[PDB]
Every structure is written in C-alpha cells, then in structure tokens.
Design a protein around this ligand. Structure first.
Ligand SMILES: Nc1ncnc2c1ncn2[C@@H]1O[C@H](COP(=O)(O)OP(=O)(O)OP(=O)(O)O)[C@@H](O)[C@H]1O
Ligand SMILES: [Mg+2]
Lengths: 187, 210
C-alpha cells in the first residue's frame, strides 16, 4: 500500500502549496492596499515587504517539494505498472532479446554492460520505428483515476514560480526568518 | 485645574493671568516661583486642581514628582509622593502619573496627590501586574526603520545617505563616532524630525547634556 501512501503525500503537498499561494496572494493584496497610502506605517511597510519575501520563498520551497513528490509518485506508479505487465509477458520479451540475456547470464561486468547497451539501443531503435504510427491509448486497467486526479503534468502555476534559483545561504537565511515569523505568529 | 497648559504657555500669558487673577507683583522671580504662587492662590480659592508628571524616589524612600517642561528641575512645581503609594498602589520609579492633586497644608512646601487617574497612558489598576523591563527576554534588531521622508525634501539627501551607509532598526545598539565640527547635531535633529513625521505612534525624545 506504499502507492496509496505516496498519493496521499502528493495530495497533501499539493493542498499545502495551494493554501500557501492563497496566503501569498492575500499578503500581496494587503501589502498593496497598505502601500496605497503614504508614510502611514513605513515600518510596517518594510515588515510587509519582508513577509512578501518570506512567503514567496516558502511557496517556492513548497512547489519544489510538490514537484519532487510528484516525480517520485510517477516513478513508483510506472515501476508498478511495468513490473506487473512484465511478469505477465516477460517470456516473449526474453525470446525477442535472447542473445543479450545469454550474454548477461555468465559474462563479466564489462561484457555485462556491453550486453546492456546492445539491448537498450536495439530496443530504442525498435521503439522509435514503431511509434511512427502514433496511436492513442487510454490509461491502465486499475490505474485510471491514479493518472486522472494526479494529472499528466504539474499545474502551470508550479512552473513559473520554481524557475528562481536560491543559493543555500538564501535558503538558510529565509528558513531562520520564517522561524522568527512562526515565533511571532505563536504569540 | 491642569497645570500643564499653564506650564507650556509662554511667560507673557502667565504674567497677564497673574495680573487678572488679583496678584500684580509676581513678575520679578523664577518661573517655578511664579507658577507656585499662582497655583497657591488659585487652590486657596477652592477649585478643582489637576496634575501630572514623572516621579522619582530619594534615598529615604519619600519621592518627588517633576515636570517635563521644567526639565525635571527641583523647583516648587514638584509634587510630594509618599512611599505608601509604592507599597500598595504598586507604582515603580519614573512612572508617569496624572490625576488629582492636593494643596499642601501648613509646613508642607510641595504639593501632594489625592488620587491617581492615569499611569503610563494606562489605567492605574492594571499597572500593578505589569512585567518588568529586565524580565523581558531580548532579541536582535528584527524591525527596520526607514529615514527617508518620502516627500522629496530639500534635505532628504542626508537621510538617504545615512540609510545607505548604515540602516537603523528598532531596538538596535548604535554609536556615531565623530570629531568636532562634524555636523552631527543637525543630522540627529533631522533623523528626529524624520521619525516624528514618518512614525506618529512611537514616542520620541532627545536628551541634551551640558
Ligand atoms: N548635509 C549638510 N548640508 C550642508 N552643510 C552641511 C551638511 N553637513 C555638514 N554641513 C556643514 O558642516 C558644518 C557643521 O556645522 P554644525 O554646527 O551643524 O556642526 P556640529 O557637528 O553639530 O557642531 P559641534 O561639533 O561644534 O557641536 C557646517 O558648516 C555645516 O554647514
Ligand atoms: Mg554640534
């Protein structure tokens, strides 16, 4: 049931990212309305700029968390699908790729990886020859809503915010800044 | 009635009210003596009197109450405060007290307090269970203060240069080392007026020594 745990973690990350962007947008709108006036709360204006920076950094961190969680979930799902189908139909695949399996059965490491690359590039050329047809295929048998609700790709809001690159010094300074943010919020 | 309004007023208005209140030979002496005698005759008439100030405690425990306008001078304008107010009312040193005052009786040079109405801009009742200054755990300069006026003033360039060179923050500990003839006095007055204009909530005062 590790698959379902992965899906639950991915959904939790997505919901956390969505609510973090919600409070982010609330922060920008509140800061804009307070900045509409002149010199009223200059110190609070600086605090609002700081909170905008903290919120955007934390949104970027949550987006990265969600991206890697989704990548892991997709990897595990495709691993499970390929594994089950391959136990179903491994004999014909072995028959069509016999010389490489005889090579891998007893040869040494260098010949092992030589057979590895022979098998892999032969199957790449076969795949690129076949995919010229480009037919359309639905999802798996019991993995329909898995590939439906998770999404083929992460949302467009998750790609325009993760392009900013922050060095580890920026990450740690923003982490401690959010630490005193949480300390103030507790009070 | 409230002595602050008749304290911050200039000498001319005070002397004019002196003649119009019935005492015309109260001009050739100190401001403290003038206000002391005027308030003495005013309270002798039997009218309501209000006072305010900042207190301090001597070595014996008996305390004085000075005024900000008089630069905390030991003139007659001070008000006697007993240690009993400290012992039951739970008032610490330097607490700003505003409320009723009592005309001192025979042998008492300084005024006394009848009751307290406001302590540190707060009700006297909840000032008893107030946390001490040293008991508060400190931190670093979390908040940032901006010295720019924002109106494009003709002298805003100095404040902007100060901000660029060394930003200032709340609760920070800073020094301005300077030789004489450095123009420091007016840059301190400039930052004082800047924080007064930009921040009307925080309290501002400037300490002048010798
Ligand atoms: N931003 C400025 N604009 C114009 N003049 C300036 C500025 N800063 C310094 N000065 C000049 O520097 C000199 C300093 O004069 P000022 O009386 O303000 O000095 P001070 O350091 O406060 O005095 P002191 O050390 O003698 O108590 C003056 O000639 C003043 O015109
Ligand atoms: Mg000077």
């Amino acid at each position: 049931t590790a698959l379902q745990q992965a899906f639950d973690t991915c959904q939790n990350n997505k919901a956390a990212w969505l609510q973090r962007k919600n409070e982010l947008a609330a922060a920008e709108q509140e800061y804009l309305r307070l900045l509409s006036g002149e010199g009223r709360n200059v110190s609070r204006l600086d605090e609002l700029r700081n909170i905008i920076e903290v919120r955007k950094w934390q949104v970027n961190q949550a987006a990265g968390r969600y991206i890697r969680s989704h990548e892991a979930v997709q990897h595990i799902s495709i691993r499970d699908r390929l594994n089950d189908f391959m136990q179903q139909h491994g004999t014909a695949l072995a028959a069509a790729l016999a010389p490489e399996l005889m090579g891998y059965s007893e040869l040494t490491a260098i010949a092992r990886n030589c057979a590895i690359q022979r098998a892999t590039d032969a199957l790449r050329e076969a795949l690129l020859s076949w995919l010229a047809k480009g037919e359309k295929i639905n999802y798996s048998a019991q993995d329909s809503d898995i590939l439906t609700t998770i999404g083929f790709r992460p949302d467009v809001a998750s790609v325009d915010d993760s392009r900013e690159k922050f060095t580890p010094a920026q990450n740690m300074i923003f982490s401690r800044k959010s630490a005193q943010l949480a300390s103030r919020q507790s009070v | 009635m409230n002595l602050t309004e008749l304290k911050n007023t200039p000498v001319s208005e005070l002397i004019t009210l002196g003649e119009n209140m019935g005492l015309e030979n109260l001009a050739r002496m100190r401001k403290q003596d003038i206000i002391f005698a005027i308030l003495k005759q005013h309270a002798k008439s039997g009218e309501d009197i209000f006072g305010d100030g900042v207190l301090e405690i001597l070595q014996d425990g008996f305390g004085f109450l000075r005024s900000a306008d008089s630069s905390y001078l030991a003139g007659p304008d001070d008000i006697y405060v007993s240690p009993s107010q400290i012992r039951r009312f739970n008032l610490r040193t330097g607490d700003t007290i505003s409320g009723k005052i009592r005309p001192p009786k025979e042998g008492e040079r300084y005024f006394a307090l009848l009751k307290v109405n406001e302590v540190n801009f707060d009700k006297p009742e909840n000032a008893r269970n107030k946390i001490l200054f040293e008991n508060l755990t400190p931190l670093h300069a979390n908040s940032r203060l901006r010295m720019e006026r924002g109106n494009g003033s003709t002298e805003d360039l100095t404040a902007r240069v100060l901000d660029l060179a060394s930003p200032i923050g709340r609760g920070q500990r800073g020094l301005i080392v300077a030789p004489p003839k450095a123009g420091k006095t007016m840059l301190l007055q400039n930052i004082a007026q800047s924080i007064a204009y930009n921040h009307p909530d925080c309290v501002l005062m400037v300490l002048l020594i010798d």
